[PDB]
Enzyme design. Structure first.
Site, PDB file in Angstrom:
ATOM      1  N   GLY A 117     -14.706   3.478 -11.656  1.00  0.00           N
ATOM      2  CA  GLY A 117     -15.225   3.466 -10.309  1.00  0.00           C
ATOM      3  C   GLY A 117     -14.241   3.814  -9.211  1.00  0.00           C
ATOM      4  O   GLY A 117     -14.666   3.916  -8.053  1.00  0.00           O
ATOM      5  N   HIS A 118     -12.953   4.018  -9.528  1.00  0.00           N
ATOM      6  CA  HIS A 118     -11.959   4.389  -8.519  1.00  0.00           C
ATOM      7  C   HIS A 118     -11.853   5.907  -8.438  1.00  0.00           C
ATOM      8  O   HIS A 118     -11.592   6.572  -9.452  1.00  0.00           O
ATOM      9  CB  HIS A 118     -10.594   3.790  -8.843  1.00  0.00           C
ATOM     10  CG  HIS A 118     -10.648   2.331  -9.163  1.00  0.00           C
ATOM     11  ND1 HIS A 118     -10.609   1.353  -8.192  1.00  0.00           N
ATOM     12  CD2 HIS A 118     -10.733   1.682 -10.349  1.00  0.00           C
ATOM     13  CE1 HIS A 118     -10.675   0.165  -8.764  1.00  0.00           C
ATOM     14  NE2 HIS A 118     -10.744   0.337 -10.074  1.00  0.00           N
ATOM     15  N   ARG A 119     -12.040   6.448  -7.232  1.00  0.00           N
ATOM     16  CA  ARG A 119     -12.038   7.891  -6.998  1.00  0.00           C
ATOM     17  C   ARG A 119     -10.842   8.262  -6.132  1.00  0.00           C
ATOM     18  O   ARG A 119     -10.883   8.094  -4.915  1.00  0.00           O
ATOM     19  CB  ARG A 119     -13.360   8.330  -6.370  1.00  0.00           C
ATOM     20  CG  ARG A 119     -14.404   8.496  -7.444  1.00  0.00           C
ATOM     21  CD  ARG A 119     -15.619   9.281  -7.020  1.00  0.00           C
ATOM     22  NE  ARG A 119     -15.336  10.686  -6.763  1.00  0.00           N
ATOM     23  CZ  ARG A 119     -16.263  11.628  -6.860  1.00  0.00           C
ATOM     24  NH1 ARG A 119     -17.485  11.277  -7.228  1.00  0.00           N
ATOM     25  NH2 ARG A 119     -15.981  12.900  -6.591  1.00  0.00           N
TER      26      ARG A 119
END
Ligand SMILES: C[C@H](CCC(=O)NCCS(=O)(=O)O)[C@H]1CC[C@H]2[C@@H]3[C@H](O)C[C@@H]4C[C@H](O)CC[C@]4(C)[C@H]3C[C@H](O)[C@]12C
Ligand SMILES: C[C@H](CCC(=O)NCCS(=O)(=O)O)[C@H]1CC[C@H]2[C@@H]3[C@H](O)C[C@@H]4C[C@H](O)CC[C@]4(C)[C@H]3C[C@H](O)[C@]12C
Ligand SMILES: C[C@H](CCC(=O)NCCS(=O)(=O)O)[C@H]1CC[C@H]2[C@@H]3[C@H](O)C[C@@H]4C[C@H](O)CC[C@]4(C)[C@H]3C[C@H](O)[C@]12C
Ligand SMILES: [Cl-]
Ligand SMILES: [Cl-]
Ligand SMILES: [Cl-]
Lengths: 220, 218, 219
Positions: free
Chosen positions: B90-92
């Site tokens: 979920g980390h972009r």
């Protein structure tokens, strides 16, 4: 049955500001530790050798220690399982003295000198993602927006919005310099919560310039 | 299951133990995890939906298709080796923030940043050293050797030896002999031929292994 | 519970604890293992025959001689540092397969691919940082410093500082002063002389330590 663990699944994160108790740790809003795979709480597993934690609390409150290096973590930080902050500086080992060995006065007499040296505070800025099992050595400053790779060993300061893996290898910057500079002026992590909510559609995107315009019209 | 290790003299056959529908492991591949205590599925394979702590949520049919862990035959996986699943979790890095804002905390403007990485694919006859970490989406070709404590984020060519931060030390044999091993694929032979050829496999005689193949396996 | 570390202020003297016949450790060397819980022989020294899980197997004699772990005096071993023993563990990169085929499963054609690496030798006055991994066969010379999380696969020269993937950062002192320390070997002095020189040992005055050696110790 076996002893409980700190997390019930890796879907769970622990808000650090509501949990942390060591007076020598400062953690800002929303920053969390997702520590399922290493079993224990942030303060007992991730932050190491910091006087005033659970095993040294009684000794710390005697007040005979003087000031120690502090661990300061910003807002909106993501700390993955097994990430480690090494505190207590050189832990008494002086590479520049003849021996690194910490002779006890009990065993070697009154000639013993204390080689403890502070390294300065460990500072993690805002919006920093720290991958699993990274190790953060004493005294480093990790600027806002940085990404620390899984298993990275960080011994130098990390520039804002840098991506760093392995042995302090900077592999890229997340954005161009001009846009990095922009994020460092508007500092969306410091906005009132309703403004962060209002601009959440922009923060979940790459449109820094939209973010900068919202700042100009609404935050200032 | 939680069958432990009594000593480091023992490994765990993986095909007989693993239950996660998102894990495929072939014959004879094992995990020698004495020094890290827990089972392969509990300790080595991390963030894979369908495991023990997330079997409930996965069975509810909410997420669709996730990256799988695929592992071939005759692999040796040493204590504490880890396969990191669940993509970017979920980390972009390409969005303004890497923080996974929750809807219940930050409202409806929140966008899901999750991105799959593709399957993690480990071929046949691969040796993974102790406490190596295999990052999402990596392919490790047949016959490769991963050094202890390696941090693998790029694909690993067949029969290469990789250590540290994706450092390719060498390849195990000459290019032509690698190609011969990749055609003949002894790990897919009927067990009788592997047994019959065991004295050749426990040697460097690749061309004598190819002679055996031509005359008996075809 | 008695072998447990109560806190990270606590270190375990190794010569008084170690029982594995295949480990030798010198005076005063210690393990500060609070953050990885278990004892030095349970957690730091790995795959050495004659440890607790393999004592009864090693009692028989099936194996013969294995690589030993030798550690000198005045060594400081931080939590979770690991010594990898048992050589190649039977995996032969020069054979067609690295897979350790068992005879019960693949028959009598199986050949043992085990190869010794040589003893793992840690010198005197060595500091091994937390979660470093020392691979089989490595010699770490006197006065060396192994950084936290380093992975050591090559020999470490005296008084060198090594981090990462065998990265030599520096030597602690000028070459001539290293040579002086390798001659006088304060770690071998009678204890009276180590105490008397403690004020020098806790400083960078190597030439003063040499003066002490010449005037009081020198054979
Ligand atoms: C446990 C982690 C942190 C949870 C947390 O405490 N968040 C606080 C946010 S806030 O202050 O309340 O806004 C969260 C962060 C991102 C989560 C991941 C991401 O959401 C992406 C997917 C989403 C899937 O539903 C479950 C797996 C998963 C891979 C998630 C697993 C896990 O719950 C993660 C990794
Ligand atoms: C625990 C490891 C794997 C066990 C396993 O499950 N093998 C499956 C083979 S098969 O499908 O049944 O053919 C085995 C493989 C190689 C073994 C090592 C090698 O055999 C070399 C030596 C041999 C000594 O007897 C014991 C120490 C030792 C260093 C062994 C320790 C341990 O038993 C090892 C490391
Ligand atoms: C646990 C470590 C080793 C203990 C030990 O076994 N000493 C044996 C020496 S001797 O044969 O009895 O001469 C000791 C060595 C250095 C110690 C550190 C150094 O002394 C520097 C500071 C001193 C503070 O009082 C406590 C924190 C601390 C950071 C110490 C914590 C801890 O007690 C350390 C790390
Ligand atoms: Cl996370
Ligand atoms: Cl193995
Ligand atoms: Cl220490």
């Amino acid at each position: 049955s076996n002893a409980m663990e700190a997390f019930n699944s890796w879907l769970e994160g622990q808000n650090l500001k509501e949990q942390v108790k060591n007076p020598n740790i400062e953690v800002g809003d929303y920053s969390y530790y997702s520590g399922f795979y290493h079993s224990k709480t942030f303060e007992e597993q991730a932050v190491r050798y910091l006087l005033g934690d659970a095993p040294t609390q009684e000794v710390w409150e005697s007040g005979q220690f003087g000031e120690v290096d502090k661990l300061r973590i910003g807002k909106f930080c993501s700390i993955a399982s097994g990430a480690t902050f090494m505190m207590a500086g050189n832990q008494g080992h002086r590479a520049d003295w003849i021996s690194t060995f910490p002779f006890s006065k009990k065993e070697f007499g009154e000639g013993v000198k204390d080689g403890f040296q502070r390294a300065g505070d460990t500072i993690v800025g805002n919006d920093v993602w720290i991958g699993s099992e990274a190790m953060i050595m004493p005294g480093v400053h990790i600027g806002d927006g940085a990404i620390i790779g899984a298993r990275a060993v960080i011994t130098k300061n990390v520039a804002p919005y840098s991506v760093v893996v392995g042995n302090n290898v900077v592999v890229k910057k997340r954005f161009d310099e001009n846009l990095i500079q922009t994020l460092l002026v508007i500092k969306w992590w410091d906005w009132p919560l309703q403004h962060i909510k209002n601009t959440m559609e922009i923060l979940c995107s790459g449109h820094i310039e939209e973010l900068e315009q919202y700042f100009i019209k609404n935050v200032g």
